[PDB]
Structure formats: C-alpha cells, structure tokens
Symmetry: D2
Subunit: 187 residues, 4 copies
Amino acid sequence: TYSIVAISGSPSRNSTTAKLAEYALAHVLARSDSQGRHIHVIDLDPKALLRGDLSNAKLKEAVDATCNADGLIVATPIYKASYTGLLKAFLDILPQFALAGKAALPLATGGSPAHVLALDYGLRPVLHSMGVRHVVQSFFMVQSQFSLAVEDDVASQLNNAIDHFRLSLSSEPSTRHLGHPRPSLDA
Amino acid sequence: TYSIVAISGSPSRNSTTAKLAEYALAHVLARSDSQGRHIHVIDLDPKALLRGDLSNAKLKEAVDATCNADGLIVATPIYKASYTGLLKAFLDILPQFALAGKAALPLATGGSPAHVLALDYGLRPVLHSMGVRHVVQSFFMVQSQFSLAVEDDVASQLNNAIDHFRLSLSSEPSTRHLGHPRPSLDA
Amino acid sequence: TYSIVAISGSPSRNSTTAKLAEYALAHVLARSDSQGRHIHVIDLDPKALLRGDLSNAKLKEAVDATCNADGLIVATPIYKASYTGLLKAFLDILPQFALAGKAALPLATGGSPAHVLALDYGLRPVLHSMGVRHVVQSFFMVQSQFSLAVEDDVASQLNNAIDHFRLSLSSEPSTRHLGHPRPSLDA
Amino acid sequence: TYSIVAISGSPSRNSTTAKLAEYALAHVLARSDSQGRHIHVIDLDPKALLRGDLSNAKLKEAVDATCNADGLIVATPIYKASYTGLLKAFLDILPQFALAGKAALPLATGGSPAHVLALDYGLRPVLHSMGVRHVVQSFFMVQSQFSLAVEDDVASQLNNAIDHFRLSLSSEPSTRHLGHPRPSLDA
C-alpha cells in the first residue's frame, strides 16, 4: 500500500497541467496497490503559502501528505523557461530533505516544444536538493495536444514515464532514507 | 536620468537579501544620474500576486515600474538550490518579453558557498527568457558575512559587480528593444 | 553478477578525480556480487575519441563496456563551472539512449565548494538525455581534502552515495529498458 | 577596429554549425570595422587539444586569438542535451578569466526544437565562469532549415541576435576588464 501525491502548480483555472497530473495519478492507482491525493497549489491559502504559515490547517495537511508520500507526481506549466513561482513556493516550505526515500515523476506542459529541457535543467536539480530517492524521466507535452486522445507516440512516452514511476515505488522500510546525504539524521 | 528598480524575493522579514539589494541600489544611485525603487515581493498582496491580478493597484504599480526600468537589481536567497518561489511568482506575471532593453544584476545570499551556481544556472536563464538586454556577473554572498562591514575581497567583488551594472546602463533610445528576438513586435 | 564501469574525465595525470572514482568502484565491488572496470578517458586515443572512430579497438571496447554496464560511476573535475570537455567527448560518442536500464553515480572534485551544483545542473541533465534509469545523489569533494583519510562527515556522505548507488543496481532483465522513452525501440 | 573570433565545435565535417558561425562572422564584419577568424575546433591537433599542450603552435595561436578578441561567436551542435565535448575541450584550456572584457554570441543547431534551452542552461553559465563581459541572446536553429534561404521569422531572429552582438562590441579600453570579479588582478 503506497501513498501517491500529485502536486500541480499552474496558476490558471482549468489547467491542462492539472489534467495531466490527474491522468498520471489515476494511471498509477489503476496499476498498483495505491491511494492518492492531488494538491492543487492554486487552492492553497496564498498568504499562508507565501509565509510558510503551518497554522493554516489545509497548508499543513498538504505539507504532511507530501512528507508521507512514497511517490510524488510533480507537474507544472513552463513559465519564463522554468517551473512556476507557485509550484516553487510550495516546494520552498517543505523540510530541507523532505524528499528522502521518495520516488518522483516530473511532468510539464507548455506552448512550444522549445520548453522541453526546463524540467531536467530547472526542476530536477530542485528535487535533488531535497534528498529525493529516485526521479525518473521527465515528460513534457505541448499544450495543444492534450485531449487520452493524444498522438500515439506521445501517449507511449507519457505512459512509459508513469509506468517507470510506478515501478520505482518502494515498499521496503529499508529505502525510506535513501537519497538523504546523512540517513541517520532523519529524512 | 535612469530608472533603477531592485526586486528582492526573500519570504523572511528583516532579510539579508533585502539589505544586499538596498546596498546595491544605493551604490548605483550614488554614482549615476538615477532614481530608484525597491520592490519587496513579500510586501505585495499574496492573493493578487499568485493570480496575476492587476486590479490590485500596488501590484500593477510594481509591474509597471519593472517594465519602465533601465536597470533591474534582482535579489533572492537560495532556497532548494534555486531562486525563491516568491521571486519567481513576481517574474511570472511580467509580460513575455518584459526585460527587453534592460540591464540586470543578479544577487543572492545563502547559508553555504555550495549555492553559488544557483544564480548562473537557475536565475540567469529565466532573465533571458524575457528578452533581457544585458545581465552582468552574478554576485553571491554567504549570509553570515553581511555586516559594508564585510571581508575586503568579498566587498571588492560585490562593488565590481554593481559598478559593471551601472556602466552597462543605457541612455540611448536605440537600445530600448535590444535583447528582444523581434524588436519591431514591441518589447 | 553486476558489471560496474567507472568513467573518469580529468585531463591531468595522477588526478584526484580518478582516485575518487577508483575508491567508489572498489567500495561497490567489496559489497556486491560485481566485476568492474575503470575507463580513464585521458588514456583513450585522442584523435579516435574526438572523431568517434570505433575502428580504434580500445575506444570501441570502452563504448561496449559502457553500454553493457548495469551501473556507471561518472567522475569529473569541475572545469569552467561544469564537467570537462574530455568527459563529455566520451559521452558524446555513446548511442543516443546508451544509458537505458542503467543506474548512475555522479562524482566530482574541484578547488572550491562553490562548484558543488555543477553536477546536478550540468552533468545530471546530460545523463538523462541518454535514457538513464536511475541517477542517485551527486557527490562533490573539495580537492584538498581527499587523502579514506578524509573528514568524517564528508566520508559519510560519500559512502552513503556509493551505498545508494549499489542498492539501486538491478539484477532483473525486466528493468533493462527502463528510463528509455520508448522501450520497444531497443535501449 | 574590432577583432571578432568565431569558435565552432561540431565534430562533423561539412557541419551546419560551422556554416551558421561563418554566416554570423560575415554578417558582423560587413557592418562594423572588424577583422575576423574562425577556429574550427575539429581542425586542432586532438592530442595537443585534450592535453592543453601549447607547444603546439596552431593550438597556442587559437588560444591567443581568443584571448585577444573583442567579441566571440560561440557555436555548437547540441549533443546529449548540451554543447559538444569538442567545444568544451577548447574552452577548458583557456585561462581562468579568459573572457574578461569580451562580448559573446551563443549559436547552436540541432535535430529538434526541444534542444533550444541547452544554450541558456548549459553554455551560458560556462561563458560566465570565465568573466565574460556581455553575452547577448542565444540563437538556436533546427538543422533541416539552414539553407540565407531560411524562413523569414527565423532569419529575423538570427540577424537580430548578430546585430545585437555587433552593437555590444566595445572600442573603449575602459571596458577591457569588465565582467572579471577582480579587474586589477588582470583579466
């Protein structure tokens, strides 16, 4: 029994990014012994989020759920050649090595295929600052393609990424600190 | 007569980052025909900021001042191996090529010298997505050093960065679109 | 029975980088059912390397050994804020998705702790272009520290990285294509 | 009278990259009081290049010409999500702050538009490690487009980049050390 948490960071309502994250979350749960939740950063209290105010219950619950996950699905539109400020603001309040022991799947969408590398150059180093155990391949989609009613090659790549994410999930308590530079100092 | 705008993105009160940005802003104004302002992103309305709501007067004023600047001083603490979510959230609402024609100076502080490269690998590509004209060298300082009552070599580097930023400033209207991939499509 | 290959890319003789890679290679072999080899890129034929000339036996053997490895240890000094040209020249001649199915451990050394992030921002995206299955945490060491006669905290971090690398190794043929965007199109 | 040096780093003969660099070099010289040269890294002695052997006359001449340039045009195909090993190998042997005082124009080509960000995330931080004065916007072209017999919008972007590069060139001896963190310690 795995706990899977998706975090999507578009600041727009009805975002393609959120739909991609949800798709991925469903795909994983359909194929593994998992329960899940989907944190839409846009639905968190803006003031409490920016100030890291964990007296806000819903923010503290989102942080706790992230720290308790076995796998994270981390999704963002590409803004100014990187992940959104909104997504990063959430990542910023997590504990220093919040991602110790965890698998992760980076997802993004954007207007142009030019944005593909923002995940691997931008988001990936941020996940690794937090002691993450295993980040699988990035997947990026051009926004006017998500409909899955998508091109067969694109669909394969996405599904393969999600498959790998699911396969990387760990039951074993022995792995719970892996990725942390100093496992005995918690995680 | 130049317009210089500092933007500092620490989510903490009494931030060293803000003091560094202010120092830099003062240093420039003392040595050039300039006026300045300092946008502390933490003082912007969190809800309006995250949603890009320009019906908020103070947010629209911050955006307008940024678009009207000849030079920007862009300062952030390093969180999770990059600039803060708070800073990026502000950068996110600016027009696509908001930085056309403008000079820029990236500044950061952090707990460890290990964070030095976050500016050049993280922030610099973001500034360049926005058509920026000229980004000079990055300067990073270890937080327990800012007192300027700082080490002589560190002080030289910082002052040299600010000097170069000032020297890069442009009077000429001929440069106002430089850095934009398609200058005739505005800036 | 795993095949572990270290690739070290210093252009200097008697390099600390090579000693770090060798240490790591030995540490892994002492704790797993593994055999290993260590490709010193400096010992490859420069002309054949730069031109990707696989009629050179020793170069073809190095490429084959890399493609056949279950785990790679990838070590470089930090030059001009990134991995060396020498290392990259070798990575450049490998097949497009050469790293499919493979685990990887990024190691570096440098003169200053300022260089720590070159691994995660520079090398890591390059490994991921090649379909790599699992890259664990980066380890960086300040060159005047390697003697292991090193500081206890540094030694822990290094050993933990190597431990995690060893633990990430896969026996299963089911994982041999994982990390490749399209597994049925080989690896 | 400016000295402009192009450095192209494709390991292939008849490279599109070299043709793009040459185009850019010609465009600049036609519009400014400049002389130029074009270092094709592939034509340097591989052994001497990899070992930084400046007893090789042609390598020392290439290094000297780079250090003496007012502007550099730096061109590479995108291999494994970054600049080539061949290009970096040349950059590696230059003095620590070789690029002090100099303007620079990053150019690349690749098979897919997905590679656009490799310049700004990969090459740009490397140029800045060397004290570069002013790096203008990156330009990337999809290889099956260079013929200039190219699409009008693409042609505009390229020409605008080169124009900006030319405009950024400095006559003044006062700028010869700008970009160096400590100008009085040479350049």
